[PDB]
Symmetry: C7
Subunit: 242 residues, 7 copies
């Protein structure tokens, strides 16, 4: 009718630990304020994800304890401002250039497939049928759907990190380089006779720079990834001693 050894094996398989989430620290792509705020937002989202994964591990431990109690119920168990322009270019180029975001996103994208790879422990029972088996299968299905949702959130956070890295690659491609602004400053200093000639160029260098930094403060504002807390396991009390 009911095989208790399957229940004990399923409890010891549910209680078994999953893989650890990655511990990569996403450093900022440059020294701009929007990039540092995006990197700190990714750090806080990763810490939130690890905290809720530990809470889900505790919920799986409580579910394994409830499965052991359900097994024990049956039987007996054992004028040109060149300074601001070249400062903006210098701040935009003095960083990791998104080489730590593409290593953060690869880890949190591999962890998505790692979390999807071991949802086999929440399968339904084979030889256990009854009214408690349906509730335990419902609890295991709730834990499985929560783990799949957490893997989806991990993939979304990896996509956010890749989006910030691609945005910094675009913002360093589009912005005028530091050495060109330094050369234009020496061209302005050496010969004032062309002050009516290179000043429309510099003004263009201003406007394009204002296009870049405005796009950086608008697009590198990440929304946080707050995960749902894990659903509570079923509480099956131990049977009273007769």
């Amino acid at each position: 009718t009911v095989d208790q050894q399957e229940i004990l094996n399923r409890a010891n398989e549910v209680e078994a630990p999953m893989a650890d989430p990655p511990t990569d620290v996403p450093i900022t792509p440059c020294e701009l304020t929007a990039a540092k705020n995006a990197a700190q937002q990714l750090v806080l989202s990763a810490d939130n994800m690890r905290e809720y994964l530990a809470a889900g591990a505790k919920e799986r431990q409580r579910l394994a304890t409830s499965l052991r109690n359900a097994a024990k119920a049956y039987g007996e168990v054992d004028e040109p401002n060149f300074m601001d322009l070249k400062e903006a270019a210098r701040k935009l180029e003095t960083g990791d250039q998104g080489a730590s975001l593409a290593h953060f996103a690869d880890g949190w994208n591999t962890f998505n497939l790692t979390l999807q790879g071991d949802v086999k422990r929440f399968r339904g029972f084979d030889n256990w049928e009854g009214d408690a088996a349906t509730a335990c299968e419902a609890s295991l299905d709730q834990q499985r759907q929560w783990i799949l949702h957490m893997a989806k959130l991990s993939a979304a956070m990896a996509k956010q990190a890749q989006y910030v890295a691609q945005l910094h690659v675009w913002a360093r491609r589009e912005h005028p380089t530091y050495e060109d602004i330094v050369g234009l400053e020496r061209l302005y200093a050496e010969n004032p006779s062309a002050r009516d000639q290179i000043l429309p160029v510099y003004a263009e260098y201003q406007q394009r720079s204002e296009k870049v930094l405005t796009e950086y403060n608008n697009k590198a504002a990440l929304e946080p990834v707050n995960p749902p807390k894990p659903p509570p396991a079923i509480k099956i009390d131990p049977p009273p001693p007769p």
Copy 2:
């Protein structure tokens, strides 16, 4: 009034096995990370689909047992970084080129029509009328709608595999070839006198390559196909012995 032989034949027809899902393994189109993650996502979705089809087979077995109990209730039964550019081109071309995705998708598209072809076993009864016949017809209709939804998910997974294959065909058409980058490197090495001439070409080769790989990391991120678990069959208990 009620013909029990029709009930026994319908139970033995519901319990009969359907066709097996295909066991093709979708290999990666190239050695990029997005293509390997897409291939692993397709492998995990296929494993999820096969697991839920086995669970549906067990639910059909329980429904056949309930139909046998309903039959037994009546009567007595028996400065140029050429290295990174040519590495990206080499990684993009060292693969199966989507020849295993188009064989995965053909199998999971034929399995869609195979699952739709044998929903005749969930038809309503002919000579059995009453109050248990309506509940058994409702259970058979629930199993039929679940099998049609599973066939729709199989067609969606085949469309995902075909989309990744078409994306890799586009990404190998658009990206600059490996031999052209190798020839441009020798053209850069043999004569530095044209270093102010072929460098705008190489820069274009950079930008187009950045257009391809950014499109590969954005478009080859598949969402998982999680199927619904099969609906529980009706439980008709055997009649008590008088």
Copy 3:
């Protein structure tokens, strides 16, 4: 007060058979896999439609039996890979060219108007008023709305068949013809001196062909037409003998 002969005539008019659905078999437009899957999907949708129309005929028979019982309650009743390109063109042209889809869709579009033409049998009663007449009129109205929904699904299936036929007409207009590819192969074989001249043309023939077949695998994926099962007729038991 209540005329039983109207009830008997309405029961014998509801039980009268409607027109048969058409039995045309939609053959594939060509030998491509997407066209064969679309034709098999249309065959399965037509079989599903005919099965549910037979189930609705049985439900109308039960409703006529209930109307006869309601009448009996009152009184006493009686390097160029030319092979793959010319194989794709050959496979695209070796078919019925959508001449059997335009004969499938015409039949299932005439059956739409045929099903809408004979919903006069579900009209409300004239001389029968009371509390059972309202329930019988509600059952006849449910059957009428179900038959109108089935006619709408027949028109939708005919539109799907016409869409696949128009897609194949476009895909044979846009794809390069077989004889042109065969002539280009002989032009490539006879004189290699123009190998740097006709190869950009052939490459264009490749790309346009990839535009066609990708559009065929994406647009000729039909969704199935699963009809709702007919609503259950009211069950009016025969009166007990006094």
Copy 4:
């Protein structure tokens, strides 16, 4: 307090017949299959509308009977395939050219204003107040809202007929004429020396014709106008004799 003569006059005004719906028969604009299916769809929608207007007349008769019972409660009452191209042009031009659709739509658009012109019979009472007067005013308001909805459906059916007529006017403006195709056939037959000259013209005549007929099979597919059945009148039983 309560004037029964107002109740009798309102019952005899509600029971008074409205204007008859028009009996124009929408003939097909041409001999194409889509135009004949659109004309048959308009015929079936007009028959459905007339049937539900007769049902609403019976419901108004029952409401007048209930108003008479409410009055009686108070006091005592008393290689070129030219054949298919010129066949398509001939079939497209051998019709009524939408001269019967513009006479169908004018009648069913005047009937919209005719149905809106005589909703004055469902006004609230003047000298009758109480608890039955509120229910009778609610029933008259339900009948008024149903008649206004039926007038809106009549205007929608007239708009469908005008849309099919405008579509046929466009499809005869855009398609190449029959006499031009007949002249091009004689130009092809008399001098084969220009077979490499007029054949790109004829091919254009093919493609434009395929643009027209595809637009005719897609746009002349009308959805049916199924009206709601009229809401049931309040049933006020006659008072018992003391």
Copy 5:
């Protein structure tokens, strides 16, 4: 506690008549059928609006009677077809040109502000508090919201009339004039030698005319403005004599 003179003054202010709706009759802009149907639709909508405003006046009279009963409860109160083309132009120009629609819409737009200007009579009471005062304030608020909705419908009807007037101004600007068609007919009659020259012009005059009249039959189809019936006033019965 309760001042009955405020209740009597509020009843005599609620019963006071508002401004009359305007009695302008919207004549047709031209002799086309769509313009005459639009003008008749505006006439029917104005008659519906005046009928429901009279019904709301009767409801305000009943509310004033209920306020007087609530006051009395406390204390003791005291080959060219030129004929059809020039007929269409003649019919399009033989009208009032929308000079009566712009006088209809101005009246029904001033009546919107007139109805919004005197909702001060539905203000809440000052010295009357209790359990009947809350219900009387709820009834006055319901009447105020209904009057504001009726003013919104008056503004919508004025916008419909202005839309028909602007449509006729456009349709007389775009259509070819009558005198130009009459001059082209004399140019066709006097010299047949230019019959291959002015006939493409006349054909253009046909097509543009078909663009105008099709736009007139499609855009001048107004939907009716059916107002909601006024909400029933609270019925407070007079107190019984002790």
Copy 6:
């Protein structure tokens, strides 16, 4: 436990009067009918806003009375038609040019910040805890949310007034000036030899004028701003004398 002096101070702070709404009268921008209707709509919306602010002041007075009763519960308290064209231009220019709308909108935009500046009186209590304190805090929070919604409506009305002013600035920029039409009339009168020359100019002056006035009658139709009535304060009855 409960400090009654805080309750008395909070009641005397809630009863304290806020700032008065501004009493600027928005005059019409010109003598057109749409501008006069927009100005009258703004006058009616401002009167509605002032009426509901007075009603909210009475509700705050009742809430202060309830807070005093809650304090007293604890302890013992103490052929060219130049005439119509130049008439339209004259009517369009004979006004205040939107100089009174930009002074209306500035007042009703400063009143938005004035209403948001003094919602500090609806703060929660400090030393008062219990079951009546929660209901009084809920009533104060309801009054605070209503005052913030009224400030939002004041900002919306100021935006409507600024929109009408900007529309009149555009409509006087785009319309042809009065002096130019007067000069064109004298140019038409002095020399008829150019009657085939300046008449296409005048026709353009017609069409552009029709573009302006149509845009004025369509865009200067304001919707009314009806505010919600203030939510009723909690009624705490005075305690009975022991």
Copy 7:
């Protein structure tokens, strides 16, 4: 079973003060009315945010008191108008140029990460299980979600301040400068012979200025940030003395 020292430590950690919100005052970017209204709106939103953060601090104090009562339950605790144009330019340039908005937004963006950095105090308990522990964990989770929502609102207010600063940078880039208008006025005054030459330039200077100020009055209208009041802490009464 239950460790009371963990409860006392968690109460003293919840009651511990968080970081103070920043006290930067956003000054106006210029002397325009829209910029001053936007700066006053940011001041009022910051004051609202600080008030609700103080209210949340009081709610955390009440939650710590409830945790101390839950711990005490177990054991015993211890004709050119140049004047208006140059006035608009002067008013647009006489300000802080958005240098105080970019210091307001940096503070309120760092406070977002500061509020997200210390939500570790609302973690679930380790050694405390039971029926009161679940309610206390639910209250701590409600406070955590409210603090995360308040951090999201702080980031939204910082984005509003950065948007007003970028809008003023654009509006000073696009508007014509003060010195150019002053030079054009002297060019108009010194030589009237070019009055037909520089007047189309000045008119352009008018129109572009009207484009700027209209964009300033439309885009610098901020909506207020009203935060939700903090959710009420659970009230666990102290145990009665036995």
